[PDB]
Swiss-Prot record, chain A:
Effect of residue 2 to A: Abolishes phosphorylation site. Abolishes increase in protein levels after DNA damage
Entry domain remark: The N-terminal and C-terminal disordered regions undergo liquid-liquid phase separation (LLPS) following homotetramerization and activation. Post-translational modifications, such as phosphorylation or lactylation affect the ability to undergo LLPS. The nuclear export signal acts as a transcriptional repression domain. The TADI and TADII motifs (residues 17 to 25 and 48 to 56) correspond both to 9aaTAD motifs which are transactivation domains present in a large number of yeast and animal transcription factors.
Protein name: Cellular tumor antigen p53
The gene coding this protein: TP53
Range within the parent protein: 19 to 55 of 393
Reported effect, residue 2 to D: Constitutively increased TP53 protein levels
Effect of residue 14 to D: Abolishes phosphorylation by MAPKAPK5
Organism: Homo sapiens
From Swiss-Prot, chain B:
Modifications the protein undergoes after translation, according to the UniProt entry: ISGylated.
Species per Swiss-Prot/TrEMBL record: Homo sapiens (Human)
Phenotype for residue 247 to L: Does not affect interaction with PCSK9
Name of the protein: Annexin A2
Listed InterPro entries: Annexin, Annexin_repeat, Annexin_repeat_CS, Annexin_sf, ANX2
Amino acid sequence: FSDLWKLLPSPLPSQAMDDLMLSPDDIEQWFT
Amino acid sequence: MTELETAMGMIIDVFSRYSGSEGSTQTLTKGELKVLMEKELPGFLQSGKDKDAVDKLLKDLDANGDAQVDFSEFIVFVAAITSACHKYFEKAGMTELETAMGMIIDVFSRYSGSEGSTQTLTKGELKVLMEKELPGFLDKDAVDKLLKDLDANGDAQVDFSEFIVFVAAITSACHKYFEKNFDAERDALNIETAIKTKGVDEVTIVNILTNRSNEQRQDIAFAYQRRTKKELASALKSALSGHLETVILGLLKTPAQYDASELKASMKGLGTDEDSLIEIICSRTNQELQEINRVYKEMYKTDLEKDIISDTSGDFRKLMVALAKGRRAEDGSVIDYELIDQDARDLYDAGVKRKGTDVPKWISIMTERSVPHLQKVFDRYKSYSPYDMLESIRKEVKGDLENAFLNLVQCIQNKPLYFADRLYDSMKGKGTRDKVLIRIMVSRSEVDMLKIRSEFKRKYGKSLYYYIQQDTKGDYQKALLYLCGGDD
Ligand SMILES: [Ca+2]
Ligand SMILES: [Ca+2]
Ligand SMILES: [Ca+2]
Ligand SMILES: [Ca+2]
Ligand SMILES: [Ca+2]
Ligand SMILES: [Ca+2]
Ligand SMILES: [Ca+2]
Ligand SMILES: [Ca+2]
Ligand SMILES: [Ca+2]
């Protein structure tokens, strides 16, 4: 990835991640 | 590779493994998503609670609404799960994908420091993390700009949510930069199955045929004929209808066969479809045009040139005939400055400088000279003329001749942008100019679709994918979307 970082030139998907609303309750249910 | 690099590569490899099993290598189908969930995140999807679980999950992750999960959607999903797991491990005090997520968590926590009850990175911690886990990514204080970019809540630290958003973004950038086993017998068997299924399984037909090269579609057609003893194109013509049929039948022809049939269609019957004739004749290269000439006479028992002559007249005919010969000078890659200047001055003298137009001069210059030469000629022409070549054409000539010259200069200057403009025109208004949209998507999917998409997004502000989504529906839409190849 070292040399790829110069090749690329990429926004932050913070709102899309927040919208999923995944919380520790979900992980607790998943881990049974 | 660093631990973080390894985790990012593992997430990319997981996506790649499951996205390649059907349809596009760029997205997950619903079935692919269910398989991925069962093998990489077992128990997360609580199937057995409800067998519709994957449909709900797909709807939750499908941000652009194409019923598939591309890598952006997948990676935001993975980041949300990882952040939730970090918070769950905090509050409470293995597959490949789970391993990668755990690795990202461990890497964050090995450089993080206590703050309140959370773990965060100050600027120095972020600096060392970047230099040891993402070498080469990082101005004298580029780490401060990275901090400000990631510090969403503005508390001068990077908590795990901000970090994982950053990791998702750079993994997505890597995958998209990477964007920018085949077996014909198996494809033919699955297509025969989809054809003979009651009601026809168009989804499988699209998934396969719009995600193979033209050569691979030829292989599939040969294997289909050998398996079934009937022609694949006839079976599909019977099995399909409407615009989807148009698309699939076009894809089944070789590039030269498709172009030849479209030209014949542009001249067969009363009048002429000059727009289509111009598009094909001005946009195609020497090799493409020579193959078209051969295949056209094979298919229709007459020369393409004779059909053009019979269907057109005047200077428009002269230009079309000359271009269709497909014997433009090849890129010599040795710059003839004297000839650049002389051609520019001749183009000026023939048009804007005088009353009327020396059209044969324009035709000679613009059909005979190589494309790089003519790019330089147009730039030099500007030095003589107050109007560039396109505006000069608009001022000098009219009708089909003007349309032909405009299209030709556009293809000489920036052919991907030419096709982007044509696609936008085919979709912008009411309904769709489906003939143009289909022809361009079929003929350019394997040629310069990435550059067409780049120019389209640059000029119109949303992706070609998006406009196709808005103008078309159903299996037809999905076929065009696969031919586009990806969003943005
Ligand atoms: Ca796929
Ligand atoms: Ca999607
Ligand atoms: Ca922060
Ligand atoms: Ca059907
Ligand atoms: Ca039909
Ligand atoms: Ca005609
Ligand atoms: Ca006409
Ligand atoms: Ca003039
Ligand atoms: Ca429209």
